[PDB]
Amino acid sequence: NGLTVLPPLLTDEMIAQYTSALLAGTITSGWTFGAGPALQIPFPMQMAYRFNGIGVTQNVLYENQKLIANQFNSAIGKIQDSLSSTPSALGKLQD
């Protein structure tokens, strides 16, 4: 009836590549790549900087590193399970 659909300029694989670049940048260099050249830093040291950001001293992170890592890993796993088990999670895009 004269109706047509145009394809988007960016394919899904290119958007996935963009997001993977953002993840790699934030995992290897913290917030530095967002304001200039990317400057490498070990990840526990970056997490210590972020604890300093909210008002907790660095030794608190350096003395509980394994517990903090385990809590993080469990939280990510629960995110995956919750998305897999609940249908009404993505209601806005469907709407």
Binding site: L6, T11, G25, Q40, I41
Partner: protein
């Protein structure tokens, strides 16, 4: 004066011929290199004048940060950077007389219009609301100080020069050089 033609949602066998997901492209020569996008065709395909070529666009260069569990990078110098940002604030205030537009100076047309009720008043009220909104916009952006401040006559700020953004006393407009350029470049 060379051009290329794209036929949308058409297979190339019913119309330098290239079959993309956007359609059939005639006049462009396909290459296996990748550059930044110049003219977007679609589905990841862009076109450029180098003849006219069509290519899959690259997202950027490749960079791998030298990550290690005991390495750090520290800056040794810096740069001062100045950048610009342009924002529109207001439109032009335009008013339409409903009766003049719709009937002109004829009286019979107006008598017939009176059978449609209060449409013209609604249109006038909407346009008046837009017109006052524009002045509100300008007030909210620019009138954020209640004192008029002036700069000292001796411009000694420790080596920093602000002459390109401060008002120019020579001009009758009392505008800075950058403001003069901005007002001359918009038609």
């Amino acid at each position: 004066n060379q051009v290329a033609v794209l036929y949308q949602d058409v297979n190339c066998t019913e119309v330098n011929v290239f079959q993309t997901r956007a359609g059939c492209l005639i006049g462009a020569e396909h290459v296996n290199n990748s550059y930044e996008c110049d003219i977007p065709i679609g589905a990841g395909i862009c076109a450029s004048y180098q003849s006219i070529i069509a290519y899959t666009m690259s997202l950027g260069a490749e960079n791998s940060v030298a990550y290690s569990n005991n390495s750090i990078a520290i800056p040794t110098n810096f740069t001062i950077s100045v950048t610009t940002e342009i924002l529109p604030v207001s439109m032009t205030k335009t008013s339409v007389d409903c009766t003049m537009y719709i009937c002109g100076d004829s009286t019979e047309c107006s008598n017939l219009l009176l059978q449609y009720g209060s449409f013209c008043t609604q249109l006038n009220r909407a346009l008046t609301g837009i017109a006052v909104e524009q002045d509100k916009n300008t007030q909210e952006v620019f009138a954020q100080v209640k004192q008029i401040y002036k700069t000292p006559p001796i411009k000694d700020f420790g080596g920093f020069n602000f002459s390109q953004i401060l008002p120019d006393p020579s001009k009758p407009s009392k505008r800075s050089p950058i403001e003069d350029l901005l007002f001359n470049k918009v038609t």
